[PDB]
Design a protein around this nucleic acid. Structure first.
Ligand SMILES: [Mg+2]
Ligand SMILES: [Mg+2]
Lengths: 67, 69, 82, 48
RNA sequence: AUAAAUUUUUAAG
RNA sequence: GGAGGUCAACAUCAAGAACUGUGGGCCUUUGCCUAUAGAACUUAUAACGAACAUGGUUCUUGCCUUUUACCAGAACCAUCCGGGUGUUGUCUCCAUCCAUAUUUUUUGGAACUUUUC
């Protein structure tokens, strides 16, 4: 989710020297630093949420898309 | 120059059709670039075995037709 | 190197016919050939010089004792010669 | 050798000359040696 | 941690 | 006969990724299928031009008394300064494949005698 713009960020920032590749093999996974169920999580409203809760964010969103 | 590819026939019983309308049988043990054959012994074709192991010269071989598949 | 040898090699796979010094014609799938025409063949019939025929599995023949080899006429076409 | 003739089309040169011409033209030379330098500046990025 | 820059004049009625 | 020319004329240059001729079969010339020969120049971050102008109509705007002249985008079209290749003519300058004999080839295991047909 953090890689949405990564490649072009890199390739420009170095003035065309450099390169990047993003690939998914080992199928690693990781905890999202938030706590999935919390009422008090801070909803940034147009900002990237603070790391203390990113999970309550992601879930409170996906549940809105689904239903 | 190149080795006769008889590694398929290694450790199998073969009818060595040999010079002068004769025959030999026996399990294949080895060979060389001249096509000499070293084989664990068998009969001369009614029938009679001579030797424990046998070595056939290259020139003498008409054919070595496989008894086993 | 010999072009006949090359031809023989090419004929690998195909059903070649094959007479010896003895005059004992064979006909079979050519398994392997070498510079010295040390042919191996599969599913091979074996005619005696007198007349009678005998089926046999995987014959080996040493080119020294080979007389002439018939290859299929498709190989005439291409692309060994030029 | 060096040119067609008086009609003056289709020039052809040798290596040493092009070495010297390449030397003298440095202030007007393009100077950028790789394609990858143009990334969002090529045409298609302008059309887009 | 920002580097984001429109124009511009003559005739006739 | 060769080299050229700030010479000319006539062809050809945007397409089913595409040209032309020819042989054979079917329909009845076209067209389809099959066989064969030759394809200059231009094209894949697409094009004759490693460049870069203007005009017409139609819409959308922008200036904003009205028309020329205009502001900046689009669609459809044209004009203009140039270019390549091919053929012919003309003009100018010159000339009449190992090198060698001891098991896979070429240093042979060939010959003699006899029967049948
Ligand atoms: Mg008036
Ligand atoms: Mg009026």
């Amino acid at each position: 989710i953090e890689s949405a713009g990564f490649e072009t960020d890199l390739r420009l920032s170095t003035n065309g020297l450099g390169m990047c590749q993003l690939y998914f093999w080992h199928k690693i996974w990781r905890k999202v630093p938030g706590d999935v169920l919390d009422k008090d999580a801070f909803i940034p409203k147009l900002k990237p949420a603070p790391i203390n809760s990113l999970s309550r964010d992601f879930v409170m969103k996906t549940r809105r898309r689904k239903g | 120059v190149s080795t006769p590819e008889l590694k398929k026939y290694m450790d199998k019983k073969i009818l060595l059709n040999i010079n002068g309308s004769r025959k030999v049988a026996g399990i294949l043990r080895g060979y060389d670039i001249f096509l000499n054959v070293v084989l664990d012994d068998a009969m001369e074709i009614n029938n009679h075995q001579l030797g424990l192991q046998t070595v056939i010269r290259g020139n003498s071989i008409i054919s070595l037709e496989a008894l086993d598949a | 190197n010999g072009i006949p040898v090359k031809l023989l090699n090419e004929a690998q796979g195909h059903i070649v016919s094959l007479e010896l010094t003895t005059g004992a014609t064979y006909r079979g799938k050519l398994v392997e050939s070498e510079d010295s025409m040390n042919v191996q063949l599969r599913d091979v019939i074996a005619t005696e010089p007198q007349g009678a025929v005998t089926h046999m599995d995987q014959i080996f023949v040493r080119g020294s004792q080979i007389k002439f080899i018939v290859v299929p006429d498709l190989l005439k076409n291409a692309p060994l010669f030029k | 050798k060096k040119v067609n003739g008086t009609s003056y089309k289709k020039w052809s040169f040798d290596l040493p000359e092009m070495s010297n011409l390449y030397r003298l033209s440095t202030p007007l030379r393009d100077e950028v040696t790789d394609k990858n330098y143009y990334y969002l500046f090529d045409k298609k990025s302008f059309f887009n």
